[PDB]
Amino acid sequence: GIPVKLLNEAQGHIVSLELTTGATYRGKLVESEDSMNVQLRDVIATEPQGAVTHMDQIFVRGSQIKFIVVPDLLKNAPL
Amino acid sequence: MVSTPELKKYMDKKILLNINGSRKVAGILRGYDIFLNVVLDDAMEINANNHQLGTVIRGNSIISLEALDA
Amino acid sequence: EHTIFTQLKKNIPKTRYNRDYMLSMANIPERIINVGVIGPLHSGKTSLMDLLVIDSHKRIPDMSKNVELGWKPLRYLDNLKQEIDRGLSIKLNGSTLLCTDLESKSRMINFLDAPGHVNFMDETAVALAASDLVLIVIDVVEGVTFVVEQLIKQSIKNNVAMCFVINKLDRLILDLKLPPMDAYLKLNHIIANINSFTKGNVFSPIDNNIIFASTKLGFTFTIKEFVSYYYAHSIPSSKIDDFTTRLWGSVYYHKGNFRTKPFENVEKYPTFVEFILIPLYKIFSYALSMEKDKLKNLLRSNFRVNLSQEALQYDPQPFLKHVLQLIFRQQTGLVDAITRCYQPFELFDNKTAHLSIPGKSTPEGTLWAHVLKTVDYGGAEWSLVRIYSGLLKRGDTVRILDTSQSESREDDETPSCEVEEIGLLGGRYVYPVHEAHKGQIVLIKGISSAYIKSATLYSVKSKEDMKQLKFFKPLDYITEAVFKIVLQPLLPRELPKLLDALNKISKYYPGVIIKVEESGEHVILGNGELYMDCLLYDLRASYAKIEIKISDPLTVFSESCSNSRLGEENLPGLSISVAAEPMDSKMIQDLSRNTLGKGQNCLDIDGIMDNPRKLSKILRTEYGWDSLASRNVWSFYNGNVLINDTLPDEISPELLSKYKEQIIQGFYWAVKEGPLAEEPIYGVQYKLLSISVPSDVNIDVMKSQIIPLMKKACYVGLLTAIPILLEPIYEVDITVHAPLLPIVEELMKKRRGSRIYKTIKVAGTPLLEVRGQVPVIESAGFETDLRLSTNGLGMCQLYFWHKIWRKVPGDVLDKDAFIPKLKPAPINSLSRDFVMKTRRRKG
Amino acid sequence: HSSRLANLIDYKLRVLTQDGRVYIGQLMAFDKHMNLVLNECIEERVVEKRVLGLTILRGEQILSTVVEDKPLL
RNA sequence: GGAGGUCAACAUCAAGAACUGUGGGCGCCUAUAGAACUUAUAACGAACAUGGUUCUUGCCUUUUACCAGAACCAUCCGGGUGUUGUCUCCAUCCAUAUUUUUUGGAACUUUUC
Numbered sequence A: 001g002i003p004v005k006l007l008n009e010a011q012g013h014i015v016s017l018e019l020t021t022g023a024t025y026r027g028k029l030v031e032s033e034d035s036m037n038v039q040l041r042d043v044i045a046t047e048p049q050g051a052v053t054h055m056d057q058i059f060v061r062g063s064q065i066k067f068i069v070v071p072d073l074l075k076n077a078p079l
Numbered sequence B: 001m002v003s004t005p006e007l008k009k010y011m012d013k014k015i016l017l018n019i020n021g022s023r024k025v026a027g028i029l030r031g032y033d034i035f036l037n038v039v040l041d042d043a044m045e046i047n048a049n050n051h052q053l054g055t056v057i058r059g060n061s062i063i064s065l066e067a068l069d070a
Numbered sequence C: 001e002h003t004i005f006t007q008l009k010k011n012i013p014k015t016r017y018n019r020d021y022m023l024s025m026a027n028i029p030e031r032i033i034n035v036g037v038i039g040p041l042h043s044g045k046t047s048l049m050d051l052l053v054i055d056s057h058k059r060i061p062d063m064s065k066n067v068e069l070g071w072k073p074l075r076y077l078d079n080l081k082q083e084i085d086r087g088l089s090i091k092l093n094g095s096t097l098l099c100t101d102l103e104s105k106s107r108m109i110n111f112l113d114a115p116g117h118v119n120f121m122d123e124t125a126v127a128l129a130a131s132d133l134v135l136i137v138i139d140v141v142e143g144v145t146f147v148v149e150q151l152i153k154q155s156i157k158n159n160v161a162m163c164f165v166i167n168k169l170d171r172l173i174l175d176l177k178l179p180p181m182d183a184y185l186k187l188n189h190i191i192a193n194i195n196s197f198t199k200g201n202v203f204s205p206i207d208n209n210i211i212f213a214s215t216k217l218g219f220t221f222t223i224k225e226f227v228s229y230y231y232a233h234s235i236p237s238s239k240i241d242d243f244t245t246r247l248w249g250s251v252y253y254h255k256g257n258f259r260t261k262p263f264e265n266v267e268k269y270p271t272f273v274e275f276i277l278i279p280l281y282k283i284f285s286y287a288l289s290m291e292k293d294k295l296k297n298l299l300r301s302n303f304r305v306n307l308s309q310e311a312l313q314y315d316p317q318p319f320l321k322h323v324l325q326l327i328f329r330q331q332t333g334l335v336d337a338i339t340r341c342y343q344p345f346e347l348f349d350n351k352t353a354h355l356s357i358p359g360k361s362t363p364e365g366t367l368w369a370h371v372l373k374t375v376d377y378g379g380a381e382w383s384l385v386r387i388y389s390g391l392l393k394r395g396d397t398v399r400i401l402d403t404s405q406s407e408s409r410e411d412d413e414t415p416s417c418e419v420e421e422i423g424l425l426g427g428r429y430v431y432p433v434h435e436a437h438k439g440q441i442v443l444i445k446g447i448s449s450a451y452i453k454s455a456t457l458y459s460v461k462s463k464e465d466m467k468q469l470k471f472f473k474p475l476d477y478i479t480e481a482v483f484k485i486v487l488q489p490l491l492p493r494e495l496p497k498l499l500d501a502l503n504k505i506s507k508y509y510p511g512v513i514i515k516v517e518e519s520g521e522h523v524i525l526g527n528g529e530l531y532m533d534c535l536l537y538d539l540r541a542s543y544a545k546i547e548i549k550i551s552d553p554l555t556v557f558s559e560s561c562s563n564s565r566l567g568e569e570n571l572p573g574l575s576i577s578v579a580a581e582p583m584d585s586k587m588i589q590d591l592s593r594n595t596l597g598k599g600q601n602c603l604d605i606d607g608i609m610d611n612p613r614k615l616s617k618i619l620r621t622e623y624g625w626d627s628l629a630s631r632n633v634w635s636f637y638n639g640n641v642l643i644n645d646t647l648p649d650e651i652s653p654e655l656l657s658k659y660k661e662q663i664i665q666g667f668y669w670a671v672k673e674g675p676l677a678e679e680p681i682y683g684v685q686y687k688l689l690s691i692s693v694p695s696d697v698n699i700d701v702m703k704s705q706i707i708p709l710m711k712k713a714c715y716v717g718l719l720t721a722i723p724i725l726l727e728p729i730y731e732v733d734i735t736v737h738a739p740l741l742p743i744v745e746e747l748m749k750k751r752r753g754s755r756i757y758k759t760i761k762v763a764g765t766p767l768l769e770v771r772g773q774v775p776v777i778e779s780a781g782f783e784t785d786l787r788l789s790t791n792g793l794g795m796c797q798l799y800f801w802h803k804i805w806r807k808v809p810g811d812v813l814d815k816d817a818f819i820p821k822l823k824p825a826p827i828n829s830l831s832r833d834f835v836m837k838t839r840r841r842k843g
Numbered sequence D: 001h002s003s004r005l006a007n008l009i010d011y012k013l014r015v016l017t018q019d020g021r022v023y024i025g026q027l028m029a030f031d032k033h034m035n036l037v038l039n040e041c042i043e044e045r046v047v048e049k050r051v052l053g054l055t056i057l058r059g060e061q062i063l064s065t066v067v068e069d070k071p072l073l
Numbered sequence E: 001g002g003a004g005g006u007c008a009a010c011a012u013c014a015a016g017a018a019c020u021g022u023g024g025g026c027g028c029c030u031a032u033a034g035a036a037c038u039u040a041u042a043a044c045g046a047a048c049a050u051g052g053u054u055c056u057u058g059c060c061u062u063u064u065a066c067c068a069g070a071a072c073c074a075u076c077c078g079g080g081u082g083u084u085g086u087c088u089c090c091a092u093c094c095a096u097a098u099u100u101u102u103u104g105g106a107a108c109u110u111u112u113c
């Protein structure tokens, strides 16, 4: 399916996302999955409060993701 | 289905997990699952009162998994 | 800048993905990659690249109506007229390409077309110096041979990941017409053969380290590539992955269930043949043999493919190629397999570390560039470099260093050239670049002048950072030149042009050595006939416009001996006595083999900077070397080895220590030259037996006295130790049909050396592998003698590995033996004849 | 099936999510889980707006779908 | 309308990027002419004959004869394409209620602005 391949193609670029938690994470993406797992670096979190933090490495569960936000050149990619 | 996740690089290293109900745990990563069930040893709660325990965390619960030291 | 780009953009033939995404991808260190392509003669290399090129580009401008259809393989990267007309790749041409993979995540790939002719191994070495990993292409018919073993040995030695491609599978089926049962077996044998030379790792059509292809026709397979594409649709995904593990070796499925048991019940085959080879054969048989109407049904039924009548209205070969390219889609099986086969962390420290000392310090934020090959493009000479670190941009002022200088390792040290432009290679065009980033390989304008051959490029803003920084080691080319040509211009007045041209040739051909004689004659060394022929062509045509005289092909000789000294200073205060000794062939071989002493491997003497206890341990361990002698190893020469050996070493070691470098400098000086022909000395060990020193050394023991004195003593010692001449020998790799064997035997006899090390039936083909040895001085024309005497059947390659100089027959110093001019020398003496002709040239 | 879903392709859509937020933009790619990809997106949390760009939503998160405008040339 | 016409007439004829001029259409695109570079002279023709001039080999120092090399021009036997008029024949994408999406951790309450 194409909605997963687009993700794999944004590996390397910087990504923004939203979780069921309520917070948004922003960073370079290293690995993804068909599940929608993620592996990122130099993340800059921002919760409901506005509280910023730093997280060196992160793994996720896709189930917990609401939606992603992806770079603009990834609209000319082949489907 | 059942994509065995990429947790080989975390084995036998310290972690800072987060789970459902805003509860979080530190531990040495022993083993992992298809569904992301986890085996942690030397498990310490983060309430800020830190209680030593010695643990199998469920997959569903997991929100994320971090690394303390690079 | 923009104007330049706009004109430039028109020139290049555009592409489907576009530059912007390909340019966009670059920033991630992990994204993108560097890959080199090597393999023996006409293995397909260039055409493999051509496949990728034709996938990528919509136009293509160059293609004829004829070629696009079928018969003439389109050649890309053969942009040199010489190569085209010669018909074999000579100088490597990169292609850079944004490629997709099975996952659908594209990466930028730098491809390098290296020449597979044995004389241009230097080119392969240059490519390897930059590439992360290597694709090694083997002809299914040819199988593997000595050059393949050499190639894999070096590749792994330099921690270059290796992925195999077995090419020309169609030939196995169409040329030899092998049965499927036997075809599998043959492939398996080949697979086995590669594995035995490899150590610590084991491939298999199931690890996806081996790719099956026909470049000519137009297809590439991995057992993964196939399963997903056609089988995968048929069955549940969970199960399928396993299918591949149950596909290779010893597995048969009877009717839904497959049992490792041989084939009980009736008709039987192991699976590879069942689901792969058989249908492949059917494709071949079916397309040529079958009525064109019949075929359509199968395409829709089996493949969901629908051809127009114009696709039928071709001919067997062009039709077949169309069908195979129709069914088997863009070569992303290849790309995907490459992608998931290399881990940066495992190799990378090791590969960087070998070229440079392990370190490492001040990582990041710093420019670093390794310059390997230089490129004679349409305009000027470009410099090819690997983005080791940081970022380059136009007009950037960059410091440049050359390796021999580096060998050596503040004000005066640093020359610099601004970088006028950076382009990205694409075979026949260059794509304009504003900036270059770590990981990628690029074309630089204007960095050329600083360096001849290799150089290391760095920018350091830090005094400690500068101190840390380690210069790249000189590239170690696979072979030594040996072949010797003497040049003179036809008209002496044109010398200046010749001189310029010779320097240019050194820049463009990394294996060439140009030396200048007293006489003003130019000694050129090159690897072999063809190699030198190409040099001469370019020299007369491309660079100089001068017609020149060329001599009679010779060879460099080496001096030696087989088993006391007295000596006197020009101001008789010093007196030197030094023993000269034959060395153990084992020792010699160990020295010739450039190594770190890894695994169980005897330590290379250039590891001498490690504790002498360790060095001596190796000598004692591997040779039962005398414990005092091992402890007294001073250094190696420019070649062999120096030992201290006398009571005065105990009497006045401090005094003697003061004179080591003067000795040390001299010895390289003295051994680099020679007493017979001013040629370098092999297999000789020297031992200082006595050294008298001037009373009260009133600045008396000067370098002006002892350096030449020492030199003299060496020469005397060699002479009294009974000197001999050594001659370089090639390894003759000959491929022939069995009944042409006797011919080959006679040729060997006729040439002089007449030595065949081994004869091996090439299992699976009507061919023999013949290994011999041949004296380079008797090699002139050897290859054509073979080709002509066998009526075009079979072929020869000469490769210098092991670099062993055999004793020249006759006694080094006897007057009597020779017979008059113009007569090939009698066998008893080839040593005496060799010296006099060389002696005269010296003066 | 999914015959209707291909018909929506390349139309400006109004997608309500379980959170209440509503995303808007064209539809480039579609899934069996109802993963939607959307181009030039804009949330309307409610007198509010934000510019995101390319957004990939999950199936869990999506509630309803509705065409805003016809397919663009 | 279509195929075929051993029917003719009239044009051109290797391919490609880039410069200049003219014309048409709305700085861009198309056509024609000239110059330069590349391909290999992949072939307009998987064929290859004669003649003229200028040079260089032999000559009776003569030919409406030649010997066998070079360069430069020509002729001759053929080929392709477009176009115009004709002629004959024929028609006018898989199925999963038990942890990463579609058989729910939902439900409910209260305070602040």
Ligand SMILES: Nc1nc2c(ncn2[C@@H]2O[C@H](COP(=O)(O)OP(=O)(O)OP(=O)(O)O)[C@@H](O)[C@H]2O)c(=O)[nH]1
Pocket (backbone or CB within 6 Å): C040, C041, C042, C043, C044, C045, C046, C047, C048, C073, C075, C087, C088, C089, C090, C114, C115, C116, C117, C167, C168, C169, C170, C171, C213, C214, C215, C216, C217
């Ligand atoms: N029969 C057959 N020959 C092939 C095939 N692929 C490549 N070749 C051979 O490869 C030759 C042309 O390939 P090139 O790429 O030009 O040669 P190359 O491999 O680059 O050789 P180098 O330039 O010396 O490396 C042909 O003469 C073929 O004999 C194949 O699928 N079938």
